[PDB]
Structure formats: C-alpha cells, structure tokens
Amino acid sequence: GPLGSMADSQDPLHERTRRLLSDYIFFCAREPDTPEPPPTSVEAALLRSVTRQIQQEHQEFFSSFCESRGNRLELVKQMADKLLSKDQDFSWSQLVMLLAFAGTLMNQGPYMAVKQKRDLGNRVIVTRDCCLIVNFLYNLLMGRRHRARLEALGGWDGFCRFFKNPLPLG
C-alpha cells in the first residue's frame, strides 16, 4: 500500500520524499526568465545534479509529449510503471529517473509572464499537476516494498554517495 507507518506526526521520510519530489517540480517549472532556487536536502542537491542529466538526455522526447497530449500525468505514472514497480527490485538509477521525468512533464499555460514581478510568476497548472504528478511518484517509491527497499539500500543517503553528491555536506 502507498500508506502505512508506525509514527503519526513523527514520520520518517514520509514528508521527506513528498517535499523533495514536489520541490523538484517547482524547480523544473522555474520560469524561463528566472532561475530556480537551491536544493533543500542532500537528495534535492544530488538529484538536481544527476536527475538534470537524465532529462537533457531523455527529456528530448519527454518534453515533446509534455506538450502533445497534455497527459503529462498519464505519462508520469506510466513510466514509473515501466521502470519502477512493486514486485520488481528497482534501482537507484530508476529512482532519480522518476524525479527527472516527473519534472520534465511539468507543463505551463500562463498568459503574459513577460512581466515577472516575483519568483511566484506561474500558472496554477504547476501546483495542480504537481500534486497529482508527485502524488503518483511519491507514493510509487513511498510504498511498502518501494520505501522498504529504498532505505534498505542506505536510503536517500546511499544515493548521495552512490551518485557522488557535488556539495560537501551529507
């Protein structure tokens, strides 16, 4: 199941993965006239360094779809089903891949961004699609078997060392 935990408010990575995933979506939608802010955690820093390459390499096709059928979400879940699974021993490479793609689908539909007053300049499509798009992935990895394994291999921590994080921290 996508849910399940022994803690109520003292959740382990529960809000750790959700916040991290959603954080990437915003960074991806980062207005084309304004750079996105820095990461929040180690996974956010490394992922942005590795996941960024996963898109520029694959996004080449993903983007095309992001503005093709508009099913940016339908594709986000579909992919996670091909790479990630429940009875399949996913891999770190698959985890970071989901994050990259997810954000790669993030579509926009503003009006006149030309006038960027602040950094919040963006349609609600990001927040709406961010909840659904991230809701699928977040739960995909935040599952019983998924999460269990994710951490069983060092968790977000093991990934940072696996993909050699750029920042000194973590």
Swiss-Prot record:
The keyword Transmembrane applies. Monoubiquitinated by UBQLN1; results in stabilization of BCL2L10 protein abundance and in relocalization from mitochondria to cytoplasm. GO terms for biological process: apoptotic process; extrinsic apoptotic signaling pathway in absence of ligand; intrinsic apoptotic signaling pathway; microtubule organizing center organization; negative regulation of apoptotic process; negative regulation of extrinsic apoptotic signaling pathway in absence of ligand; negative regulation of intrinsic apoptotic signaling pathway; positive regulation of apoptotic process. Its cofactor is Ca(2+). Promotes cell survival by suppressing apoptosis induced by BAX but not BAK. Increases binding of AHCYL1/IRBIT to ITPR1. Reduces ITPR1-mediated calcium release from the endoplasmic reticulum cooperatively with AHCYL1/IRBIT under normal cellular conditions. Under apoptotic stress conditions, dissociates from ITPR1 and is displaced from mitochondria-associated endoplasmic reticulum membranes, leading to increased Ca(2+) transfer to mitochondria which promotes apoptosis. Belongs to the Bcl-2 family. This is Bcl-2-like protein 10. It comes from Mus musculus (Mouse). The lineage of its organism: Eukaryota, Metazoa, Chordata, Craniata, Vertebrata. The gene is Bcl2l10.
